Amino acid sequence: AFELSPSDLEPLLQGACFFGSGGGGTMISARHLAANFRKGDYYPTDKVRVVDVDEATDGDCVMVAYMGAPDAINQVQWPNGPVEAALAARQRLESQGRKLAYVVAPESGALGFVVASLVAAKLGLAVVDADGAGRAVPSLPMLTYAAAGVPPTPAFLAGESGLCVELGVRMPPPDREDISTVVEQMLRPILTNPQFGQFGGLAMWMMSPAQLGGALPVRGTLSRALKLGRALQDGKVKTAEAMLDFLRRELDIKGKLLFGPATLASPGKVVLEDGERRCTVLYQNESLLAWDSALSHPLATAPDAISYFVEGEGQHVFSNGDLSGNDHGLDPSVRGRKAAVIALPAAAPLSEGLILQSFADELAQLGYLGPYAPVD
Amino acid sequence: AFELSPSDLEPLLQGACFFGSGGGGTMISARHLAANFRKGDYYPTDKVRVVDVDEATDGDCVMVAYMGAPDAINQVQWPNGPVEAALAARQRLESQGRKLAYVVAPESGALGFVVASLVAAKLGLAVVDADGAGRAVPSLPMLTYAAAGVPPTPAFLAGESGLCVELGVRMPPPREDISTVVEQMLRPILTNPQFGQFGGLAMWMMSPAQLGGALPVRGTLSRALKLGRALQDGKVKTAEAMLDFLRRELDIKGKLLFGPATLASPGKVVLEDGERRCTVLYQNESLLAWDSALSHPLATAPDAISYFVEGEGQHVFSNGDLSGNDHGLDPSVRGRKAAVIALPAAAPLSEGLILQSFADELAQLGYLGPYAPVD
């Protein structure tokens, strides 16, 4: 439907970061990768073709991404791992008489769309304007791919030199954890192997055009990330109120102001104080809960997204990783500016069924065993 | 070439235990599995076809075994895991227009040959009379399959209830050995809750042509059965007799390192003979033997280090089989005097890459000296 250019990666990652609910990869590593995107030896093209789910019909699709420790990922310059993983998936599809023609980010976040875009440009594929949740999630069963029941394996993990590992999982008949969870439980340790270096490219959930539809119910996530990013980069939204206005009027999203704007205190949680009024946002990577000291129930809970907005001039959106810095352990920029916490209503496919249960389980591990209470 | 019957498994695991250099799986876990070997609902036959390496030409072969925690493994009664892993290999090969006709143990040991034999009878395959070392080994690179460059993956790990995982590894040049990398990934997978610390393993798929080169140490299964039978028929009751038997019947020039002597209570095993003391160091397999009075070890891997308890009854024990309820030892151990015997390594183990693999292992245990063949 449309195409991306190198200059579109900056606003894209910005918007995606805000839709990442605190997780989804740091803008730092996203910028590191985007800085080298330009036609040349490595990238045969400068343009990235992006198609809608209903257009992705001339071949099969696969989810592609980076997985592992951010510390290691923040050092990457080129996406060798993801490119190599997607190539393994393409080769397998070729051996089965099919053509790999599409890649897709697993979730919404600074890295997700960028990685998928770079891989597509590198292999001559098209990236789907969609992802598994419309937000960033701590684990695989929270993505629509898992709910739709797309076989998770063969899964491909790849290094930056040429190391490639394949993983296949067959669960025994129900008598039992989610197959997605099991796969994730086995993939992550493999990346701790010296050959990987705590991170690596991932390629899984290969799909035929038939599976795509039900597998990707949350759509237009890449384009909305780009539209918001452009407005951010252009300085059209410098206040929490302006962010809510933009979301409502331009993206038809009714976000809720959970707290602030207040001051971010020095540090998995981040605290904000508004004069004898404390708010604590709990996160694994992604923010999952927001607590007001004075209330027995949380302000918001996943699947609803929880995102920060730092008012003033400069970077307005940050992932939890991006907030960490050299000042008081906080980024020197955030130190001194008023920050707010915004909740975004989860997209419909996440608000019920297996995905919701998956979220309840994750939250249960974090101590919240109440029901899902839509901010909307 | 020949068939095994249920009554042949006891002798087999006993003789194999002795050629296990202290490791290769416990005799108790091996006995748990063999005790249930009979035609019935699980096994379609009481026979186990065993073939020579140059005789295994009617199809491909694959290494098969149990991997993981001894505590969890010795609780099993049927080789579901290895059987399922072998099955996954057969269908992969079949999907590629090839036939899986054989299985082979990875090493000599109480569990090795027994698991391979039960898998074979279960799936209608034959077991190859050989293993990758002629002894039990601590890690994959010390096996001839690794030295031969047989691709390790696809590797299949299977649980006892239907769980089946596949691992594939393709590396780049110019880093460790692929065997080592594969093992470092295979093991953590088994610690996953779905596996419960252990599992069945099928890897190093081979064509008849690859089999030959990959398996230079041969006749180890029948070699194990031959000794085990001798042990069971009361033909060898002393270390002296054992040394004699190995020489006359198996053409093996063994060496008495220490004893007969008494065992100690509290990975090391100590023996005391009057004023002298011998300590055998082990992970699972015994790797070094020390005499408190000598600055150099009495023996070192690749040479096998094995025990022989004199008297009537059980003469062979893996390090794991010695742990008991008496003084921390097996009730029947303490009362009798035991000896430590070293078996010269098979030629393929005392040279090239496999030798260096043994050196690195030994180094991590403190011994940075060179290999000194007992023979």
Side-chain angles (χ1 to χ4, degrees), chain A residues 1-93 95-98 100-169 171-174 177 179-207 209-265 267-275 277 279-283 285-323 325 329 331-332 336-337 339-356 358-375, chain B residues 1-159 161-169 171-174 178-252 254-264 266-276 278-322 324 326 328-331 335-336 338-355 357-363 365-373:
Chain A
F2 66 93
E3 61 185 12
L4 304 167
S5 69
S7 66
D8 292 327
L9 301 182
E10 170 61 9
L12 175 56
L13 60 91
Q14 291 236 205
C17 177
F18 184 74
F19 288 119
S21 187
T26 69
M27 289 168 78
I28 306 174
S29 73
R31 279 169 179 163
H32 280 164
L33 287 173
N36 291 302
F37 182 46
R38 59 185 185 65
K39 198 177 190 301
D41 189 39
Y42 194 98
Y43 296 106
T45 185
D46 212 44
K47 299 171 165 52
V48 176
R49 195 145 42 72
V50 186
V51 301
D52 296 280
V53 178
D54 296 313
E55 298 180 304
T57 60
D58 303 308
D60 292 349
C61 185
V62 194
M63 178 279 259
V64 68
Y66 254 130
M67 179 187 237
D71 283 42
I73 301 174
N74 280 309
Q75 302 176 53
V76 181
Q77 289 296 85
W78 316 79
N80 286 357
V83 168
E84 202 66 43
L87 272 171
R90 169 179 248 171
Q91 178 181 285
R92 176 61 105 288
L93 285 168
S95 79
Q96 306 180 314
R98 292 191 75 69
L100 196 238
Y102 311 103
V103 282
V104 61
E107 44 175 42
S108 282
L111 263 187
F113 294 119
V114 178
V115 169
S117 294
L118 297 181
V119 171
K122 175 66 174 177
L123 304 183
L125 314 172
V127 53
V128 178
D129 188 5
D131 70 78
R135 53 163 296 165
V137 306
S139 85
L140 302 176
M142 278 157 261
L143 298 181
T144 52
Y145 304 107
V150 175
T153 69
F156 303 105
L157 287 173
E160 298 294 300
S161 56
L163 172 277
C164 172
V165 179
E166 183 185 318
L167 195 283
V169 175
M171 296 295 282
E177 191 93 65
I179 192 163
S180 301
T181 297
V182 184
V183 165
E184 186 182 63
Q185 286 174 180
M186 299 180 177
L187 294 174
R188 296 185 185 290
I190 292 172
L191 292 177
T192 71
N193 186 77
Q195 300 301 145
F196 274 103
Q198 306 303 293
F199 82 108
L202 166 66
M204 62 186 281
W205 281 319
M206 293 179 270
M207 303 162 156
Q211 295 175 300
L212 260 205
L216 287 60
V218 188
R219 314 176 175 184
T221 60
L222 192 157
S223 47
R224 69 157 196 204
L226 177 64
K227 183 171 177 186
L228 166 61
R230 280 173 173 174
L232 286 169
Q233 181 180 30
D234 298 334
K236 298 182 187 178
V237 45
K238 304 175 176 296
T239 60
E241 186 184 320
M243 171 55 99
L244 295 173
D245 286 1
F246 184 84
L247 291 168
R248 186 183 62 264
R249 304 173 186 167
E250 294 292 354
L251 300 170
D252 189 47
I253 291 175
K254 298 190 178 185
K256 184 182 177 185
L257 209 193
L258 301 181
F259 186 93
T263 76
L264 289 168
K269 58 192 171 185
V270 302
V271 187
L272 296 73
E273 291 191 294
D274 183 53
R277 256 267 162 160
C279 174
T280 310
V281 178
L282 307 181
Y283 69 94
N285 275 313
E286 289 65 47
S287 294
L288 301 165
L289 304 85
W291 283 97
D292 179 308
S293 313
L295 291 163
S296 311
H297 61 277
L299 286 169
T301 293
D304 290 339
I306 292 164
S307 297
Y308 312 115
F309 186 92
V310 191
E311 296 184 344
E313 305 283 352
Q315 192 54 54
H316 301 299
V317 304
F318 294 83
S319 71
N320 291 131
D322 289 298
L323 281 184
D331 184 292
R337 295 191 291 160
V341 181
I342 294 175
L344 303 175
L350 269 39
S351 68
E352 60 177 61
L354 303 170
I355 298 287
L356 184 67
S358 188
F359 272 94
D361 291 351
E362 181 76 7
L363 297 159
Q365 301 167 175
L366 280 75
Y368 179 77
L369 295 77
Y372 165 43
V375 288
Chain B
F2 79 90
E3 303 169 325
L4 290 167
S5 288
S7 60
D8 297 314
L9 298 180
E10 241 306 300
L12 173 65
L13 60 91
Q14 221 154 66
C17 174
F18 184 70
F19 289 113
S21 190
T26 62
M27 282 180 58
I28 77 95
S29 66
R31 278 157 164 169
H32 286 173
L33 290 168
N36 297 308
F37 182 46
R38 65 178 180 182
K39 195 278 184 55
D41 273 29
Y42 193 87
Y43 301 101
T45 178
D46 306 81
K47 302 167 178 291
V48 181
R49 163 79 117 294
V50 183
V51 302
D52 185 86
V53 176
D54 299 322
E55 179 171 31
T57 63
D58 307 314
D60 291 350
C61 179
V62 63
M63 181 287 119
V64 67
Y66 257 120
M67 173 185 259
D71 289 53
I73 293 171
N74 84 78
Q75 291 288 67
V76 77
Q77 299 285 153
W78 313 85
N80 286 181
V83 165
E84 284 291 315
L87 232 187
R90 182 158 75 190
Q91 43 207 198
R92 173 56 54 71
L93 287 172
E94 198 156 301
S95 73
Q96 286 171 23
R98 295 180 74 77
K99 182 178 173 290
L100 191 266
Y102 319 101
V103 288
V104 65
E107 44 177 46
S108 285
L111 266 184
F113 299 128
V114 181
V115 171
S117 299
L118 296 174
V119 171
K122 177 62 177 167
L123 303 177
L125 310 169
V127 61
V128 179
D129 188 4
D131 68 89
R135 54 163 289 160
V137 158
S139 181
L140 298 187
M142 293 166 259
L143 289 178
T144 58
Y145 306 108
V150 174
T153 68
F156 306 102
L157 283 178
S161 48
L163 197 293
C164 180
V165 180
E166 191 193 329
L167 187 67
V169 179
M171 267 156 75
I178 185 165
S179 321
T180 296
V181 176
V182 166
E183 189 184 71
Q184 297 182 318
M185 296 183 160
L186 288 184
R187 296 187 180 290
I189 294 177
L190 295 179
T191 66
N192 182 92
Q194 300 300 315
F195 273 104
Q197 298 305 302
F198 76 114
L201 170 75
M203 64 184 281
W204 279 313
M205 288 187 283
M206 300 164 280
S207 63
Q210 178 66 92
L211 241 214
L215 245 11
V217 190
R218 309 174 184 183
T220 60
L221 193 163
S222 57
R223 181 189 70 176
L225 181 59
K226 195 179 173 179
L227 170 67
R229 286 172 163 168
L231 291 167
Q232 183 182 58
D233 296 313
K235 284 188 171 66
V236 42
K237 304 183 183 303
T238 58
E240 179 182 63
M242 173 56 99
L243 285 176
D244 281 33
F245 183 86
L246 298 159
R247 192 187 189 198
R248 301 200 194 78
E249 294 296 77
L250 304 178
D251 191 12
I252 299 174
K255 182 181 174 180
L256 199 188
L257 302 181
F258 192 88
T262 65
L263 283 295
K268 62 183 69 183
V269 176
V270 187
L271 300 86
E272 292 180 294
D273 184 47
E275 197 79 305
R276 282 191 301 179
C278 175
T279 314
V280 172
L281 298 172
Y282 70 95
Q283 218 55 62
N284 289 301
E285 291 62 50
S286 293
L287 296 172
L288 304 92
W290 287 94
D291 177 339
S292 60
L294 297 171
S295 52
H296 64 282
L298 290 164
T300 188
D303 294 335
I305 296 171
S306 298
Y307 309 117
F308 186 91
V309 184
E310 294 186 348
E312 309 295 349
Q314 196 56 58
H315 306 300
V316 301
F317 298 83
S318 67
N319 289 135
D321 290 307
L322 288 170
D326 189 296
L329 307 175
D330 167 72
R336 309 146 62 195
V340 185
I341 299 178
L343 302 172
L349 264 46
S350 56
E351 183 170 284
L353 299 174
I354 277 184
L355 184 59
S357 185
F358 276 108
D360 293 359
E361 182 75 10
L362 292 172
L365 295 182
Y367 182 71
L368 283 140
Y371 168 40

